[PDB]
Amino acid sequence: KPRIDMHSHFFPRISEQEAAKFDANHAPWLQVSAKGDTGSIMMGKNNFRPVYQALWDPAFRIEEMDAQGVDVQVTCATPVMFGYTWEANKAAQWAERMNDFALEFAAHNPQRIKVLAQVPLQDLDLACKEASRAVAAGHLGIQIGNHLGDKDLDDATLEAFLTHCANEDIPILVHPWDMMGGQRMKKWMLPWLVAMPAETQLAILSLILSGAFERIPKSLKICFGYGGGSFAFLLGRVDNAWRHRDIVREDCPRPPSEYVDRFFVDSAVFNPGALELLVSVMGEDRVMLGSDYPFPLGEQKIGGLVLSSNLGESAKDKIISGNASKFFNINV
Amino acid sequence: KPRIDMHSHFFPRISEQEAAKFDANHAPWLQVSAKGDTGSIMMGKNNFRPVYQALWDPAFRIEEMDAQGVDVQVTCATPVMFGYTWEANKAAQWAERMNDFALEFAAHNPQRIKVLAQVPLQDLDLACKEASRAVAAGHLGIQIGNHLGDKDLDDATLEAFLTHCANEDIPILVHPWDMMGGQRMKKWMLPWLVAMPAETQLAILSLILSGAFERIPKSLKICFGYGGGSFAFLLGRVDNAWRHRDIVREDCPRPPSEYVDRFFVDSAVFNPGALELLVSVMGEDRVMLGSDYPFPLGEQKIGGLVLSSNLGESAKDKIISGNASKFFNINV
Numbered sequence: 120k121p122r123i124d125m126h127s128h129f130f131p132r133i134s135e136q137e138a139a140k141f142d143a144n145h146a147p148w149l150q151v152s153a154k155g156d157t158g159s160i161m162m163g164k165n166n167f168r169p170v171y172q173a174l175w176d177p178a179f180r181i182e183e184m185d186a187q188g189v190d191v192q193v194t195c196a197t198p199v200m201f202g203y204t205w206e207a208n209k210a211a212q213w214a215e216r217m218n219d220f221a222l223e224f225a226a227h228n229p230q231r232i233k234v235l236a237q238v239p240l241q242d243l244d245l246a247c248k249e250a251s252r253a254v255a256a257g258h259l260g261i262q263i264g265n266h267l268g269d270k271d272l273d274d275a276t277l278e279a280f281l282t283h284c285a286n287e288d289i290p291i292l293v294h295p296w297d298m299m300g301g302q303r304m305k306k307w308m309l310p311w312l313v314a315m316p317a318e319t320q321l322a323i324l325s326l327i328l329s330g331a332f333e334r335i336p337k338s339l340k341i342c343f344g345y346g347g348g349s350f351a352f353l354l355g356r357v358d359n360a361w362r363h364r365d366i367v368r369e370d371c372p373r374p375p376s377e378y379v380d381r382f383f384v385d386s387a388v389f390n391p392g393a394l395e396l397l398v399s400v401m402g403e404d405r406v407m408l409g410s411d412y413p414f415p416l417g418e419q420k421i422g423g424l425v426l427s428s429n430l431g432e433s434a435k436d437k438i439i440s441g442n443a444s445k446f447f448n449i450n451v
Numbered sequence: 452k453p454r455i456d457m458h459s460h461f462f463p464r465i466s467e468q469e470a471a472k473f474d475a476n477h478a479p480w481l482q483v484s485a486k487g488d489t490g491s492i493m494m495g496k497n498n499f500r501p502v503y504q505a506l507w508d509p510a511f512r513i514e515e516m517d518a519q520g521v522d523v524q525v526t527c528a529t530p531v532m533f534g535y536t537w538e539a540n541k542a543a544q545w546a547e548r549m550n551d552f553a554l555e556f557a558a559h560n561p562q563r564i565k566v567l568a569q570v571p572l573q574d575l576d577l578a579c580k581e582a583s584r585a586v587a588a589g590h591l592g593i594q595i596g597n598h599l600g601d602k603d604l605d606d607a608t609l610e611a612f613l614t615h616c617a618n619e620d621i622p623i624l625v626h627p628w629d630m631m632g633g634q635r636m637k638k639w640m641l642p643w644l645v646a647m648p649a650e651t652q653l654a655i656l657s658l659i660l661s662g663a664f665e666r667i668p669k670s671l672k673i674c675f676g677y678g679g680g681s682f683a684f685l686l687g688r689v690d691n692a693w694r695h696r697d698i699v700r701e702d703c704p705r706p707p708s709e710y711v712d713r714f715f716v717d718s719a720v721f722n723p724g725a726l727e728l729l730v731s732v733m734g735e736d737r738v739m740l741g742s743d744y745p746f747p748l749g750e751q752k753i754g755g756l757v758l759s760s761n762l763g764e765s766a767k768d769k770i771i772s773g774n775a776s777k778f779f780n781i782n783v
């Protein structure tokens with residue numbers, strides 16, 4: 120059985136002065152130490168995140184997959200590369216540059232490294248073009264942020280994008296980014312612990328309660344990061360509301376929990392009971408191993424949590440291999 | 452066996468002028484309709500929120516209690532009553548009558564109807580003043596908003612307040628209000644499904660990761676509303692972050708999951724699996740039955756989820772009744 124990890128990120132070699140050529144405050148670039156082993160994602164002139172080789176260097180990444188026992192890894196852009204706020208033609212350009220970088224990275228060993236495209240989502244026309252092009256060019260689908268400022272997934276532009284992908288049999292992974300919280304969550308990585316899972320839950324819900332899933336064709340393949348946030352756990356609150364308020368029910372014809380057959384989630388929930396509640400709510404067919412490699416708060420032993428749970432033989436196979444094979448049409 | 456509902460709310464009978472004497476524009480009052488079965492919480496001259504009778508009628512509440520088999524019920528201010536933005540010294544008094552009004556509602560019957568108080572939390576001194584006098588007066592503890600603007604519970608000022616309450620041996624129910632989200636959660640009661648649980652989780656993690664518990668004594672009896680939100684579901688992720696980053700660990704000397712013996716949660720989670728997972732995280736002694744009566748999104752069949760679960764019979768007894776009596780001081 121081949122182990123598949125479908126949530127991992129990369130960042131290419133981009134010089135400071137080139138990030139500038141797009142935007143001197145918000146275009147990210149990669150400062151690497153001369154040692155070669157480490158560096159940081161930068162932002163204008165500011166440190167954004169400490170990183171290490173496996174992020175940019177595909178050769179190095181292979182050992183680490185050998186070491187982890189990971190055969191096939193589907194990887195994508197680091198969310199900070201998204202460029203969703205920017206002027207649209209630069210973002211469309213930026214995306215095309217990055218999705219090419221990504222193809223290269225994978226070319227090192229295209230059998231074992233698969234990529235996902237980023238798109239200039241603030242512009243529906245350019246975004247569908249990049250989606251279609253980049254999948255022509257090798258990508259197995261797209262990764263988008265869960266929202267566009269105060270447009271959430273129920274917005275018509277975002278729905279139309281999912282609908283473009285649906286119609287072209289292009290899979291989508293949705294990653295939270297640009298977290299709500301303004302000024303309250305500056306210490307202890309709260310943005311990662313509180314805002315992020317709520318962000319993701321809210322992507323799922325914006326689609327459910329807006330009646331979006333009645334409009335998007337049933338053939339869409341859409342997956343949600345980090346177990347779909349707290350979605351599964353708060354699903355009962357959601358149904359309850361739905362049953363007792365017209366305003367909650369107005370746009371959503373079926374109970375919200377009936378819609379769990381319309382998307383997938385990854386496995387990264389960091390706890391045996393959570394994963395089980397998750398697989399319980401979602402079904403063993405809709406969960407995929409993702410690790411969030413190679414970041415500090417990803418699963419440092421990939422598959423560990425699944426490999427050693429109270430779970431089905433076939434279910435574990437589905438989660439570590441089966442599900443993702445189909446979702447991404449990876450020839451097992 | 453005597454069922455206790457420790458999460459409910461009231462609004463008082465304040466005459467517009469006898470209210471506006473505080474703020475002609477922002478002090479909330481209650482308008483009682485034609486028949487007498489329906490109302491509206493009014494803001495100065497504005498229609499804020501319509502309301503059914505049991506929010507204001509103690510005599511009527513009793514009948515509904517008897518109909519549910521609730522023997523004792525603890526009720527607190529509706530979040531609109533808070534006024535944590537308001538000029539301290541004014542609210543210091545405004546809180547006082549809110550709390551006297553409360554006692555006035557709990558006068559009709561004290562064996563069965565119990566009160567917690569609100570405070571002018573924006574000024575520490577006035578709030579500490581008020582809590583003590585209000586408890587002395589006959590309130591059983593207090594209810595606070597989870598946050599005050601950008602000021603979360605890791606605040607030395609808030610922390611101080613809680614340490615005060617532990618020392619005077621006063622219990623505290625934490626409720627989420629004034630939800631994060633800016634312009635984003637506008638339909639389908641999204642703030643209540645997403646913002647609310649995130650907020651409650653934020654409040655709990657604020658104490659844990661800030662180190663607040665290594666400075667606040669074991670004597671604080673603090674409960675968090677709505678099952679602690681998504682806290683118990685996401686605990687796995689926090690322990691993982693903590694293990695993997697210095698900034699998560701920097702102020703919290705022990706793994707976050709160990710602090711689960713320093714607080715309580717109510718049980719309003721509206722799902723069998725969620726409840727068991729939550730008791731699995733918190734234990735039978737730290738989960739109390741709360742309905743959120745009389746709001747529509749409260750539990751209809753009060754106690755139903757607990758009584759309908761595969762849990763230890765005496766565990767059931769503790770949620771329903773045992774724990775709350777100890778926690779609040781309710782004669783069995």
Ligand SMILES: [Co+2]
Pocket residue numbers: 126128294344411
């Ligand atoms: Co990620």
Ligand SMILES: [Co+2]
Pocket residue numbers: 458459460626676743
């Ligand atoms: Co409430």
